């Protein structure tokens with residue numbers, strides 16, 4: 001979804017990306033609620049990966065809140081939009097060979 | 104030396120393979136309207152190697 | 162009967178076929194690729210000579226397929242060996258009939274690979290180079306994510322912002338003002354602004370031919 | 383030019399072949415236009431071209447006095463040419479002669 005946008009984007013297309021962005025961050029909030037209920041927060045702070053999830057999800061949420069206002073028309077701080085892509089590192093840790101090589 | 108020649112020779116073929124491929128693709132297609140400043144071209148094989156080696160060194 | 166063909170391989174004729182690969186390799190460097198359908202006198206001979214090399218290799222496939230089995234012969238390093246023969250015959254067959262006819266000739270640049278396959282003293286060193294490539298996949302994988310993570314970030318920040326270049330104010334001609342166009346951001350935005358006698362109008366002259374900007378995602382990689 | 387040389391019978395054999403695509407064609411067209419600019423109104427001229435076949439860039443097909451007007455026609459025809467085909471000097475020179 002983050003790779004879909006391109007210059008000269010369609011107003012309808014822009015909305016669709018935002019809709020998915022709202023949806024996807026919603027699922028990653030289910031990851032939050034579902035995980036934290038499984039075991040209390042004190043264990044959530046134990047591993048950095050779970051800690052790294054704190055700032056990522058909230059960063060996404062505040063961006064959605066900032067989406068309520070419309071400085072532009074479908075005829076500004078853009079620092080929290082990068083937290084979505086940065087979560088991809090969690091995928092990198094899956095590989096047993098690479099993580100030990102980097103670690 | 105019996106192995107350095109083999110290794111360097113093997114490297115030479117790779118440059119030849121891509122140099123020959125470059126001619127088949129970009130051979131004579133660098134003739135643009137602008138003033139001919141395209142010295143690093145793919146026109147003829149002896150001059151194609153220099154262009155390929157230039158990419159290798161980057 | 163088939164035994165007669167097999168015993169030929171015993172006779173050291175691998176020298177002549179290998180020299181044909183080298184001989185052909187010298188027949189590709191001489192080929193001058195003129196810009197637009199032109200061809201000097203020599204290029205006319207090489208295409209005729211190209212037929213000979215095709216026949217010499219084609220007969221060998223028959224000699225080496227009957228002797229070593231149709232199924233087993235591909236199951237070796239010769240897979241590319243037959244790969245050239247199959248598609249090269251298409252090239253000569255299709256060209257004589259008359260698009261992509263000319264571009265299909267690129268497969269012939271692979272024949273030199275047969276040269277490194279023929280000599281067993283060089284197949285080992287090539288496998289030595291390749292055998293060392295497996296560990297580097299992890300480095301390749303990391304570089305793949307470095308490209309992806311940074312390319313996506315590039316999209317968000319530099320989302321096609323290099324499409325405003327300075328234009329002359331006189332208005333006789335609508336062309337970029339500076340002989341070396343550089344992206345400009347007009348007032349109300351951070352960046353450079355034109356000189357006393359030119360304006361930054363939203364055309365497109367920032368990147369060189371629109372190849373080195375962050376517009377698309379492919380352009381971002 | 384009036385005293386430098388006597389009248390002429392020009393015949394410019396523009397080589398519009400595949401090998402002259404790009405800058406070379408621009409130089410050819412500019413040089414041919416300049417040459418036609420260096421012809422008096424009392425000498426004849428024509429502009430042929432060979433690309434494995436010697437056609438004529440213009441509508442004349444013979445020598446046309448290099449007048450103030452004919453020069454313009456030849457200049458426009460030269461400007462609107464393209465590189466293509468295979469060069470053939472023999473056929474072009476035969477056509478010219």
Ligand SMILES: *[C@@H]1O[C@H](CO)[C@@H](O)[C@H](O)[C@H]1NC(C)=O
Nearest residue numbers: 439458459460461462463464
């Ligand atoms: C240029 O010459 C070509 C020759 O076929 C012709 O089709 C074209 O209309 C000409 N253009 C002009 C502007 O004279």
